[PDB]
Amino acid sequence: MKIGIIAAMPEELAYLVQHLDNTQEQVVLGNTYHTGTIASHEVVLVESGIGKVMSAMSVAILADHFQVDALINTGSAGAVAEGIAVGDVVIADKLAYHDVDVTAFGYAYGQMAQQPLYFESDKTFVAQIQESLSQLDQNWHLGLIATGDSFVAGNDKIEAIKSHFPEVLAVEMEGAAIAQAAHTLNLPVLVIRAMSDNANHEANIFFDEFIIEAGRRSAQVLLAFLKALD
Amino acid sequence: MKIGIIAAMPEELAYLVQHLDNTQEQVVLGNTYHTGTIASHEVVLVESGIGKVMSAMSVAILADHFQVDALINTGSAGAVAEGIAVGDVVIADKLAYHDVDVTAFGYAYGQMAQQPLYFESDKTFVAQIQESLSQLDQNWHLGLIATGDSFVAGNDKIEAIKSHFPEVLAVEMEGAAIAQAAHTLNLPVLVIRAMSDNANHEANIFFDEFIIEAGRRSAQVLLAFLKALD
Numbered sequence A, B: 001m002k003i004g005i006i007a008a009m010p011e012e013l014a015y016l017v018q019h020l021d022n023t024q025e026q027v028v029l030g031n032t033y034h035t036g037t038i039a040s041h042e043v044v045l046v047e048s049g050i051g052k053v054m055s056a057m058s059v060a061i062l063a064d065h066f067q068v069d070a071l072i073n074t075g076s077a078g079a080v081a082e083g084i085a086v087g088d089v090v091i092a093d094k095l096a097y098h099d100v101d102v103t104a105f106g107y108a109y110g111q112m113a114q115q116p117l118y119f120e121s122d123k124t125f126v127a128q129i130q131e132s133l134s135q136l137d138q139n140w141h142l143g144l145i146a147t148g149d150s151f152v153a154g155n156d157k158i159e160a161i162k163s164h165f166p167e168v169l170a171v172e173m174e175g176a177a178i179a180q181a182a183h184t185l186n187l188p189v190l191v192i193r194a195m196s197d198n199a200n201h202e203a204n205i206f207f208d209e210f211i212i213e214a215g216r217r218s219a220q221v222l223l224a225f226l227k228a229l230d
Ligand SMILES: CSC[C@H]1N[C@@H](c2c[nH]c3c2N=CNC3N)[C@H](O)[C@@H]1O
Pocket: A008, A009, A049, A050, A051, A075, A076, A077, A078, A079, A150, A151, A152, A153, A171, A172, A173, A174, A175, A196, A197, A198, A199, A200, A203, A207, B102, B113
Protein backbone atom coordinates (compact mmCIF):
# COMPACT_ATOMS: atom_id res chain seq x y z
CA MET A 1 0.00 0.00 0.00
CA LYS A 2 0.93 3.69 -0.13
CA ILE A 3 1.22 5.34 3.29
CA GLY A 4 0.91 9.07 3.87
CA ILE A 5 2.92 10.11 6.94
CA ILE A 6 2.21 13.45 8.62
CA ALA A 7 4.21 15.32 11.26
CA ALA A 8 3.26 18.80 12.46
CA MET A 9 6.79 20.16 12.85
CA PRO A 10 10.19 19.55 11.22
CA GLU A 11 11.61 17.98 14.40
CA GLU A 12 8.98 15.26 14.06
CA LEU A 13 9.73 14.38 10.42
CA ALA A 14 13.54 14.66 10.33
CA TYR A 15 14.29 11.10 11.47
CA LEU A 16 11.95 9.59 8.85
CA VAL A 17 13.41 11.69 6.05
CA GLN A 18 16.87 10.49 7.08
CA HIS A 19 15.63 6.90 6.74
CA LEU A 20 13.74 7.34 3.47
CA ASP A 21 14.96 5.16 0.59
CA ASN A 22 14.70 6.27 -3.05
CA THR A 23 14.01 9.74 -1.68
CA GLN A 24 12.52 12.43 -3.90
CA GLU A 25 11.04 15.79 -2.90
CA GLN A 26 8.07 17.42 -4.64
CA VAL A 27 6.76 20.90 -3.93
CA VAL A 28 2.97 20.98 -3.94
CA LEU A 29 0.93 24.04 -2.98
CA GLY A 30 3.94 25.53 -1.23
CA ASN A 31 4.88 22.50 0.86
CA THR A 32 7.41 19.71 0.46
CA TYR A 33 6.25 16.12 0.00
CA HIS A 34 8.91 13.43 0.38
CA THR A 35 8.24 10.34 -1.73
CA GLY A 36 10.08 7.04 -1.50
CA THR A 37 10.03 3.80 0.46
CA ILE A 38 10.57 2.65 4.02
CA ALA A 39 11.12 -1.08 4.57
CA SER A 40 9.90 -1.61 1.00
CA HIS A 41 6.70 0.30 1.82
CA GLU A 42 5.78 3.16 -0.51
CA VAL A 43 5.35 6.35 1.52
CA VAL A 44 4.90 10.11 1.28
CA LEU A 45 6.19 12.22 4.16
CA VAL A 46 4.96 15.72 4.91
CA GLU A 47 5.35 18.41 7.57
CA SER A 48 1.79 19.76 7.77
CA GLY A 49 2.15 22.63 10.19
CA ILE A 50 0.40 22.84 13.58
CA GLY A 51 -3.31 22.41 14.26
CA LYS A 52 -6.54 20.98 12.91
CA VAL A 53 -6.65 22.99 9.69
CA MET A 54 -3.05 22.49 8.61
CA SER A 55 -3.09 18.75 9.31
CA ALA A 56 -6.49 18.33 7.65
CA MET A 57 -5.14 20.07 4.53
CA SER A 58 -2.17 17.70 4.38
CA VAL A 59 -4.49 14.69 4.52
CA ALA A 60 -6.59 16.06 1.67
CA ILE A 61 -3.54 16.70 -0.51
CA LEU A 62 -1.99 13.32 0.29
CA ALA A 63 -5.21 11.69 -0.89
CA ASP A 64 -5.98 13.94 -3.87
CA HIS A 65 -2.45 14.50 -5.17
CA PHE A 66 -0.63 11.33 -4.13
CA GLN A 67 -3.50 8.84 -3.84
CA VAL A 68 -2.32 7.44 -0.50
CA ASP A 69 -4.06 4.31 0.83
CA ALA A 70 -3.45 4.94 4.53
CA LEU A 71 -2.44 7.67 6.95
CA ILE A 72 -0.09 7.69 9.92
CA ASN A 73 0.64 10.61 12.24
CA THR A 74 3.82 10.85 14.30
CA GLY A 75 5.03 13.53 16.68
CA SER A 76 4.94 14.97 20.18
CA ALA A 77 2.15 15.24 22.75
CA GLY A 78 1.57 16.23 26.36
CA ALA A 79 1.36 13.44 28.94
CA VAL A 80 -1.78 13.68 31.06
CA ALA A 81 -2.48 10.25 32.56
CA GLU A 82 -0.72 9.82 35.90
CA GLY A 83 2.47 7.79 35.58
CA ILE A 84 3.23 8.52 31.94
CA ALA A 85 6.71 10.01 31.72
CA VAL A 86 8.30 12.49 29.36
CA GLY A 87 9.81 10.42 26.56
CA ASP A 88 7.18 7.68 26.69
CA VAL A 89 5.40 6.73 23.48
CA VAL A 90 1.61 6.55 23.23
CA ILE A 91 -0.05 4.61 20.44
CA ALA A 92 -3.62 5.83 19.99
CA ASP A 93 -6.14 3.04 19.61
CA LYS A 94 -8.82 5.75 19.59
CA LEU A 95 -8.92 9.53 19.17
CA ALA A 96 -11.42 12.22 20.12
CA TYR A 97 -11.63 16.00 20.36
CA HIS A 98 -11.54 17.47 23.85
CA ASP A 99 -12.50 20.96 22.65
CA VAL A 100 -15.67 20.30 20.65
CA ASP A 101 -19.13 21.20 21.95
CA VAL A 102 -22.12 20.62 19.68
CA THR A 103 -24.13 19.21 22.59
CA ALA A 104 -27.01 21.62 21.95
CA PHE A 105 -28.08 19.24 19.16
CA GLY A 106 -27.76 16.10 21.26
CA TYR A 107 -24.23 15.09 20.30
CA ALA A 108 -21.97 13.77 23.05
CA TYR A 109 -19.42 16.26 24.35
CA GLY A 110 -16.39 16.23 22.06
CA GLN A 111 -18.36 14.86 19.11
CA MET A 112 -18.27 16.98 15.96
CA ALA A 113 -21.51 17.36 14.00
CA GLN A 114 -21.92 14.64 11.35
CA GLN A 115 -19.06 12.67 12.95
CA PRO A 116 -18.65 9.77 15.40
CA LEU A 117 -17.43 10.64 18.92
CA TYR A 118 -14.36 8.42 18.59
CA PHE A 119 -12.14 7.83 15.58
CA GLU A 120 -10.47 4.43 15.72
CA SER A 121 -6.98 3.60 14.53
CA ASP A 122 -6.88 0.66 12.12
CA LYS A 123 -7.29 -2.57 14.10
CA THR A 124 -4.66 -4.37 12.01
CA PHE A 125 -2.16 -1.53 12.44
CA VAL A 126 -2.76 -1.48 16.20
CA ALA A 127 -2.43 -5.25 16.50
CA GLN A 128 0.82 -5.28 14.55
CA ILE A 129 2.46 -2.30 16.22
CA GLN A 130 1.94 -3.89 19.64
CA GLU A 131 3.60 -7.06 18.36
CA SER A 132 6.68 -5.02 17.42
CA LEU A 133 6.98 -3.71 20.98
CA SER A 134 7.99 -5.60 24.14
CA GLN A 135 5.45 -6.37 26.85
CA LEU A 136 8.31 -5.93 29.32
CA ASP A 137 8.87 -2.36 28.13
CA GLN A 138 6.72 -0.09 30.31
CA ASN A 139 7.51 3.07 28.35
CA TRP A 140 5.02 2.59 25.53
CA HIS A 141 1.26 2.84 26.02
CA LEU A 142 -1.89 1.99 24.08
CA GLY A 143 -4.89 4.22 24.65
CA LEU A 144 -6.82 7.39 24.00
CA ILE A 145 -5.21 10.58 22.74
CA ALA A 146 -7.47 13.65 22.89
CA THR A 147 -7.08 16.46 20.36
CA GLY A 148 -7.76 20.18 20.49
CA ASP A 149 -6.71 23.40 18.78
CA SER A 150 -4.95 24.46 21.98
CA PHE A 151 -1.64 23.78 23.67
CA VAL A 152 -2.57 22.35 27.08
CA ALA A 153 -0.42 23.94 29.78
CA GLY A 154 -2.17 23.82 33.13
CA ASN A 155 -3.67 21.35 35.57
CA ASP A 156 -6.97 23.21 35.30
CA LYS A 157 -7.35 22.33 31.63
CA ILE A 158 -6.02 18.82 32.21
CA GLU A 159 -8.75 18.32 34.82
CA ALA A 160 -11.37 19.76 32.48
CA ILE A 161 -10.33 17.39 29.70
CA LYS A 162 -10.36 14.42 32.07
CA SER A 163 -13.89 15.30 33.23
CA HIS A 164 -14.99 14.56 29.66
CA PHE A 165 -12.50 11.78 28.85
CA PRO A 166 -11.21 10.21 32.10
CA GLU A 167 -9.11 7.64 30.22
CA VAL A 168 -7.15 10.15 28.14
CA LEU A 169 -3.43 9.32 28.10
CA ALA A 170 -2.03 12.28 26.15
CA VAL A 171 -3.13 15.45 24.37
CA GLU A 172 -2.08 17.10 21.12
CA MET A 173 -3.33 19.27 18.26
CA GLU A 174 -3.65 17.12 15.13
CA GLY A 175 -4.44 13.53 16.08
CA ALA A 176 -8.22 13.48 15.85
CA ALA A 177 -8.10 15.96 12.97
CA ILE A 178 -6.05 13.58 10.84
CA ALA A 179 -8.24 10.69 12.03
CA GLN A 180 -11.39 12.64 11.11
CA ALA A 181 -10.04 13.45 7.66
CA ALA A 182 -8.96 9.83 7.20
CA HIS A 183 -12.42 8.64 8.27
CA THR A 184 -14.01 10.99 5.72
CA LEU A 185 -11.88 9.39 3.01
CA ASN A 186 -12.49 5.84 4.27
CA LEU A 187 -8.75 5.42 4.81
CA PRO A 188 -7.11 3.49 7.68
CA VAL A 189 -5.25 5.63 10.21
CA LEU A 190 -2.79 5.30 13.09
CA VAL A 191 -1.50 7.94 15.48
CA ILE A 192 1.75 7.63 17.43
CA ARG A 193 3.06 10.34 19.77
CA ALA A 194 6.02 10.64 22.16
CA MET A 195 5.63 12.77 25.30
CA SER A 196 7.45 16.10 25.12
CA ASP A 197 5.92 17.59 28.27
CA ASN A 198 3.41 17.13 31.10
CA ALA A 199 0.76 19.51 29.71
CA ASN A 200 1.02 21.57 32.91
CA HIS A 201 2.21 25.09 33.80
CA GLU A 202 5.73 24.15 32.67
CA ALA A 203 4.60 22.59 29.37
CA ASN A 204 6.00 25.30 27.07
CA ILE A 205 9.45 24.95 28.67
CA PHE A 206 9.49 21.14 28.51
CA PHE A 207 8.22 21.24 24.92
CA ASP A 208 11.06 23.56 23.88
CA GLU A 209 13.50 21.28 25.66
CA PHE A 210 12.20 17.92 24.43
CA ILE A 211 10.66 18.45 20.99
CA ILE A 212 13.75 17.11 19.20
CA GLU A 213 13.91 13.95 21.34
CA ALA A 214 10.14 13.37 21.31
CA GLY A 215 10.01 13.76 17.55
CA ARG A 216 12.80 11.23 17.14
CA ARG A 217 11.38 8.69 19.60
CA SER A 218 7.94 8.74 17.99
CA ALA A 219 9.55 8.31 14.57
CA GLN A 220 11.74 5.43 15.80
CA VAL A 221 8.65 3.54 16.91
CA LEU A 222 7.04 4.23 13.54
CA LEU A 223 10.12 2.99 11.68
CA ALA A 224 10.20 -0.21 13.75
CA PHE A 225 6.49 -0.65 13.00
CA LEU A 226 6.93 -0.18 9.25
CA LYS A 227 9.83 -2.64 9.16
CA ALA A 228 7.61 -5.28 10.78
CA LEU A 229 4.41 -4.40 8.89
CA ASP A 230 5.54 -6.03 5.64
CA MET B 1 -10.60 34.39 -11.94
CA LYS B 2 -11.80 30.98 -10.74
CA ILE B 3 -13.71 31.17 -7.45
CA GLY B 4 -14.11 28.26 -5.07
CA ILE B 5 -17.31 28.62 -3.04
CA ILE B 6 -17.78 26.63 0.16
CA ALA B 7 -20.91 26.01 2.21
CA ALA B 8 -20.97 23.72 5.25
CA MET B 9 -24.48 22.30 4.75
CA PRO B 10 -26.75 21.57 1.76
CA GLU B 11 -29.20 24.29 2.82
CA GLU B 12 -26.40 26.82 2.37
CA LEU B 13 -25.41 25.72 -1.14
CA ALA B 14 -28.81 24.96 -2.75
CA TYR B 15 -29.56 28.50 -3.95
CA LEU B 16 -26.16 28.86 -5.62
CA VAL B 17 -26.47 25.50 -7.36
CA GLN B 18 -29.89 26.60 -8.64
CA HIS B 19 -28.28 29.73 -10.11
CA LEU B 20 -25.13 28.11 -11.48
CA ASP B 21 -24.80 28.50 -15.26
CA ASN B 22 -23.47 25.62 -17.37
CA THR B 23 -23.67 23.48 -14.24
CA GLN B 24 -21.94 20.10 -14.03
CA GLU B 25 -21.49 17.78 -11.05
CA GLN B 26 -18.28 15.82 -10.48
CA VAL B 27 -17.42 13.42 -7.67
CA VAL B 28 -13.98 13.93 -6.14
CA LEU B 29 -12.89 11.97 -3.07
CA GLY B 30 -16.49 11.06 -2.35
CA ASN B 31 -17.87 14.60 -2.47
CA THR B 32 -19.72 16.51 -5.17
CA TYR B 33 -18.14 19.54 -6.80
CA HIS B 34 -20.37 21.75 -8.96
CA THR B 35 -18.51 23.46 -11.80
CA GLY B 36 -19.89 26.25 -13.96
CA THR B 37 -20.12 30.02 -14.11
CA ILE B 38 -21.85 32.89 -12.35
CA ALA B 39 -21.77 36.22 -14.20
CA SER B 40 -18.67 35.63 -16.36
CA HIS B 41 -16.97 34.10 -13.32
CA GLU B 42 -15.84 30.49 -13.39
CA VAL B 43 -16.75 28.87 -10.08
CA VAL B 44 -16.64 25.57 -8.21
CA LEU B 45 -19.28 24.98 -5.54
CA VAL B 46 -18.94 22.46 -2.73
CA GLU B 47 -20.73 21.42 0.45
CA SER B 48 -17.77 20.81 2.76
CA GLY B 49 -19.44 19.43 5.85
CA ILE B 50 -19.34 21.06 9.29
CA GLY B 51 -16.27 22.20 11.19
CA LYS B 52 -12.64 23.21 10.87
CA VAL B 53 -11.38 19.92 9.42
CA MET B 54 -14.09 19.40 6.80
CA SER B 55 -13.94 22.97 5.54
CA ALA B 56 -10.12 22.91 5.48
CA MET B 57 -10.15 19.75 3.36
CA SER B 58 -12.53 21.40 0.89
CA VAL B 59 -10.18 24.37 0.50
CA ALA B 60 -7.23 22.06 -0.14
CA ILE B 61 -9.09 20.06 -2.78
CA LEU B 62 -10.47 23.17 -4.49
CA ALA B 63 -6.91 24.46 -4.85
CA ASP B 64 -5.19 21.15 -5.67
CA HIS B 65 -7.85 19.60 -7.91
CA PHE B 66 -9.56 22.64 -9.46
CA GLN B 67 -6.82 25.27 -9.18
CA VAL B 68 -9.15 27.97 -7.85
CA ASP B 69 -7.78 31.52 -7.53
CA ALA B 70 -9.96 32.68 -4.64
CA LEU B 71 -12.22 31.32 -1.91
CA ILE B 72 -15.60 32.49 -0.65
CA ASN B 73 -17.58 30.99 2.21
CA THR B 74 -21.34 31.41 2.56
CA GLY B 75 -23.79 30.12 5.13
CA SER B 76 -25.36 30.58 8.56
CA ALA B 77 -23.95 31.94 11.81
CA GLY B 78 -25.10 32.87 15.29
CA ALA B 79 -25.71 36.56 16.03
CA VAL B 80 -23.82 37.76 19.11
CA ALA B 81 -23.43 41.55 18.86
CA GLU B 82 -26.41 43.34 20.43
CA GLY B 83 -28.91 44.56 17.86
CA ILE B 84 -28.10 42.07 15.12
CA ALA B 85 -31.28 40.24 14.17
CA VAL B 86 -31.99 36.78 12.83
CA GLY B 87 -31.90 37.05 9.06
CA ASP B 88 -29.26 39.79 9.04
CA VAL B 89 -26.19 39.27 6.86
CA VAL B 90 -22.66 39.74 8.18
CA ILE B 91 -19.74 40.26 5.83
CA ALA B 92 -16.53 39.38 7.63
CA ASP B 93 -13.75 41.89 7.04
CA LYS B 94 -11.68 39.86 9.51
CA LEU B 95 -11.86 36.40 11.08
CA ALA B 96 -10.31 34.83 14.17
CA TYR B 97 -10.67 31.70 16.28
CA HIS B 98 -12.42 32.11 19.62
CA ASP B 99 -11.45 28.61 20.82
CA VAL B 100 -7.68 28.58 20.29
CA ASP B 101 -5.27 28.84 23.21
CA VAL B 102 -1.54 28.61 22.50
CA THR B 103 -0.81 31.51 24.85
CA ALA B 104 1.74 29.44 26.79
CA PHE B 105 4.20 30.27 23.99
CA GLY B 106 3.39 33.97 23.92
CA TYR B 107 0.75 33.96 21.19
CA ALA B 108 -2.30 36.15 21.67
CA TYR B 109 -5.42 34.30 22.76
CA GLY B 110 -7.16 32.89 19.69
CA GLN B 111 -3.97 32.88 17.62
CA MET B 112 -2.95 29.49 16.22
CA ALA B 113 0.75 28.60 16.31
CA GLN B 114 2.57 29.70 13.14
CA GLN B 115 -0.45 31.84 12.20
CA PRO B 116 -1.52 35.48 12.50
CA LEU B 117 -4.23 36.33 15.06
CA TYR B 118 -6.58 37.75 12.42
CA PHE B 119 -7.19 36.52 8.89
CA GLU B 120 -8.38 39.32 6.61
CA SER B 121 -10.94 39.07 3.84
CA ASP B 122 -9.60 40.44 0.56
CA LYS B 123 -9.69 44.24 0.75
CA THR B 124 -10.89 44.53 -2.84
CA PHE B 125 -13.68 41.98 -2.28
CA VAL B 126 -14.75 43.80 0.88
CA ALA B 127 -14.76 47.20 -0.80
CA GLN B 128 -16.77 45.93 -3.76
CA ILE B 129 -19.39 43.99 -1.82
CA GLN B 130 -20.20 47.08 0.24
CA GLU B 131 -20.80 48.91 -3.04
CA SER B 132 -23.42 46.32 -4.02
CA LEU B 133 -25.33 46.97 -0.80
CA SER B 134 -27.41 49.99 0.26
CA GLN B 135 -26.25 52.24 3.09
CA LEU B 136 -29.93 52.71 3.95
CA ASP B 137 -30.28 48.96 4.53
CA GLN B 138 -29.55 48.32 8.22
CA ASN B 139 -29.76 44.54 7.91
CA TRP B 140 -26.26 43.89 6.59
CA HIS B 141 -23.13 44.34 8.70
CA LEU B 142 -19.38 44.48 8.17
CA GLY B 143 -17.11 43.23 10.91
CA LEU B 144 -15.56 40.36 12.83
CA ILE B 145 -16.79 36.79 12.70
CA ALA B 146 -15.19 34.48 15.28
CA THR B 147 -14.82 30.77 14.56
CA GLY B 148 -14.67 27.69 16.76
CA ASP B 149 -15.29 23.95 16.55
CA SER B 150 -18.36 24.39 18.75
CA PHE B 151 -21.98 25.41 18.28
CA VAL B 152 -22.44 28.41 20.58
CA ALA B 153 -25.72 28.10 22.48
CA GLY B 154 -25.54 30.03 25.74
CA ASN B 155 -24.99 33.58 26.96
CA ASP B 156 -22.19 32.22 29.15
CA LYS B 157 -20.09 31.21 26.16
CA ILE B 158 -21.08 34.39 24.31
CA GLU B 159 -19.70 36.44 27.20
CA ALA B 160 -16.55 34.33 27.27
CA ILE B 161 -15.98 34.89 23.55
CA LYS B 162 -16.63 38.63 23.92
CA SER B 163 -14.06 38.85 26.71
CA HIS B 164 -11.47 37.88 24.10
CA PHE B 165 -13.03 39.58 21.05
CA PRO B 166 -15.35 42.38 22.21
CA GLU B 167 -16.16 43.48 18.64
CA VAL B 168 -17.33 40.06 17.44
CA LEU B 169 -20.55 40.28 15.42
CA ALA B 170 -21.32 36.62 14.79
CA VAL B 171 -19.94 33.15 15.44
CA GLU B 172 -19.70 30.02 13.33
CA MET B 173 -17.62 26.89 12.71
CA GLU B 174 -15.76 27.29 9.40
CA GLY B 175 -14.98 30.94 8.68
CA ALA B 176 -11.51 31.30 10.17
CA ALA B 177 -10.65 27.75 9.12
CA ILE B 178 -11.35 28.55 5.48
CA ALA B 179 -9.55 31.89 5.88
CA GLN B 180 -6.55 30.13 7.47
CA ALA B 181 -6.40 27.58 4.67
CA ALA B 182 -6.72 30.34 2.06
CA HIS B 183 -3.96 32.31 3.80
CA THR B 184 -1.71 29.23 3.69
CA LEU B 185 -2.26 29.04 -0.07
CA ASN B 186 -1.86 32.80 -0.55
CA LEU B 187 -5.39 33.00 -1.97
CA PRO B 188 -7.84 35.87 -1.40
CA VAL B 189 -10.85 35.00 0.75
CA LEU B 190 -14.24 36.39 1.75
CA VAL B 191 -16.72 35.12 4.31
CA ILE B 192 -20.43 35.96 4.26
CA ARG B 193 -22.94 34.60 6.80
CA ALA B 194 -26.65 35.13 7.49
CA MET B 195 -27.88 34.88 11.09
CA SER B 196 -29.81 31.69 11.79
CA ASP B 197 -29.97 32.13 15.56
CA ASN B 198 -28.87 34.15 18.58
CA ALA B 199 -26.18 31.75 19.83
CA ASN B 200 -28.03 31.50 23.15
CA HIS B 201 -29.90 28.78 25.03
CA GLU B 202 -32.44 28.58 22.18
CA ALA B 203 -29.86 28.50 19.36
CA ASN B 204 -30.46 24.87 18.37
CA ILE B 205 -34.19 25.54 17.96
CA PHE B 206 -33.70 28.74 15.97
CA PHE B 207 -31.03 27.08 13.83
CA ASP B 208 -33.42 24.24 12.96
CA GLU B 209 -36.11 26.78 12.14
CA PHE B 210 -33.98 29.24 10.16
CA ILE B 211 -31.20 27.31 8.42
CA ILE B 212 -33.09 27.24 5.11
CA GLU B 213 -33.76 31.00 5.15
CA ALA B 214 -30.29 31.89 6.45
CA GLY B 215 -28.58 29.77 3.80
CA ARG B 216 -30.68 31.43 1.10
CA ARG B 217 -30.12 35.00 2.33
CA SER B 218 -26.35 34.55 2.56
CA ALA B 219 -26.29 33.06 -0.95
CA GLN B 220 -28.47 35.87 -2.31
CA VAL B 221 -25.95 38.45 -1.11
CA LEU B 222 -23.09 36.46 -2.64
CA LEU B 223 -24.91 36.13 -5.97
CA ALA B 224 -25.61 39.87 -6.08
CA PHE B 225 -21.93 40.45 -5.27
CA LEU B 226 -20.69 38.13 -8.03
CA LYS B 227 -23.02 39.76 -10.57
CA ALA B 228 -21.45 43.13 -9.75
CA LEU B 229 -17.86 42.01 -9.16
CA ASP B 230 -16.97 41.41 -12.81
C1 LIG C 1 3.67 24.41 19.44
S1 LIG C 1 2.00 23.74 19.62
C2 LIG C 1 2.39 22.03 20.14
C3 LIG C 1 2.61 21.00 19.01
N1 LIG C 1 3.15 19.76 19.60
C4 LIG C 1 2.07 18.84 20.05
C5 LIG C 1 1.97 18.99 21.65
C6 LIG C 1 2.98 18.65 22.54
N2 LIG C 1 2.69 18.86 23.81
C7 LIG C 1 1.41 19.37 23.79
C8 LIG C 1 0.93 19.46 22.47
N3 LIG C 1 -0.33 19.93 22.04
C9 LIG C 1 -1.12 20.32 23.06
N4 LIG C 1 -0.78 20.30 24.40
C10 LIG C 1 0.49 19.82 24.81
N5 LIG C 1 0.82 19.80 26.11
C11 LIG C 1 0.85 19.37 19.22
O1 LIG C 1 0.23 18.28 18.46
C12 LIG C 1 1.33 20.56 18.28
O2 LIG C 1 1.68 20.05 16.93
